[PDB]
């Protein structure tokens, strides 16, 4: 029992202690809804790879309708930027494809994009695999033209993991090493319903505290089917802060003495983006 109290205040005191050196963030769609990226919570085929292979046009039509007007990371994203800058961030595992972690200043070394990313796209032909930037992908999406490779005319696909596809190799190689030595799991904006990503919480040492910042309690073991234990008499390390990710991260920042630093960073970065 490393937390002195199963509260946000207890987690904050723990992170200010000598013992908390390596933080892993696990994040999902709830950390980007305040940036305008929608959380998506027969019709489920539009994100399954078998249908995409048969007809890619509805995915690219959907991508145009849901492309965000601007890429402005949230307070939550910039809280993770503070973790990196203060030397606490071991890794951010994200379920999100929206690139906002990168825009907030997390580097590829900092990130496991477990479900891929729109940041880059590739020709699907095994012998070609020409890479395309999001700028190029965006204009093909917005022209309502199915993106084709300029070298071989095969389909060009954003580097995202469709449902039914294997996760990237880097997800498994990082998780095998990272979770040996994690001092704190910050689980933000995910209800832990997507596998194998959700199983990450059970990979931490049993003594590692886990803070969930989310609209609902999640990750508890199902009564019919390493789960989160917030409320039992045996609960010893898991904390649930229930609300919007931005507000939860602002609350934790304030307890850490980072509130002014976080506000200044968000305002300056947002002003810079607004000016582009």
């Amino acid at each position: 029992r490393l937390l002195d109290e199963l509260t946000l205040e207890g987690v904050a005191r723990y992170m200010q202690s000598e013992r908390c050196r390596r933080v892993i963030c696990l994040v999902g769609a709830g950390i980007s809804t305040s940036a305008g990226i929608p959380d998506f919570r027969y019709p489920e085929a539009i994100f399954e790879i078998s249908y995409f292979k048969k007809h890619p046009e509805p995915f690219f039509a959907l991508a145009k309708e849901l492309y965000p007007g601007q890429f402005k990371p949230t307070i939550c994203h910039y809280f993770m930027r503070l973790l990196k800058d203060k030397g606490l961030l071991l890794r951010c595992y994200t379920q999100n494809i929206d690139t906002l972690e990168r825009i907030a200043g997390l580097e590829q070394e900092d990130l496991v994009e477990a479900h891929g990313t729109f940041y880059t796209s590739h020709c699907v032909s095994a012998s070609c695999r020409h890479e395309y930037p999001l700028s190029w992908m965006k204009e093909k999406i917005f022209s309502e033209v199915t993106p084709k490779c300029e070298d071989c005319q095969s389909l060009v696909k954003p580097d995202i993991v469709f449902f039914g596809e294997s996760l990237p190799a880097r997800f498994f190689s990082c998780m095998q090493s990272d979770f040996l030595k994690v001092d704190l799991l910050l689980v933000m904006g995910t209800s832990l319903q997507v596998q194998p990503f959700a199983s990450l919480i059970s990979k931490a040492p049993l003594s590692t505290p886990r803070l969930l910042i989310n609209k609902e309690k999640a990750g508890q073991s199902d009564p019919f089917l390493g789960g989160m234990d917030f409320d039992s008499k045996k609960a010893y390390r898991d904390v649930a802060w229930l609300g919007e990710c931005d507000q939860g991260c602002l609350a934790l920042a304030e307890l850490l003495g980072w509130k002014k630093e976080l506000e200044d960073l968000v305002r300056r970065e947002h002003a810079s983006i607004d000016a582009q």
Binding site: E165, Q193, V194, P196
Partner: peptide, 5 residues
Amino acid sequence: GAKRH
């Protein structure tokens, strides 16, 4: 293994 809901 694969991305599963």
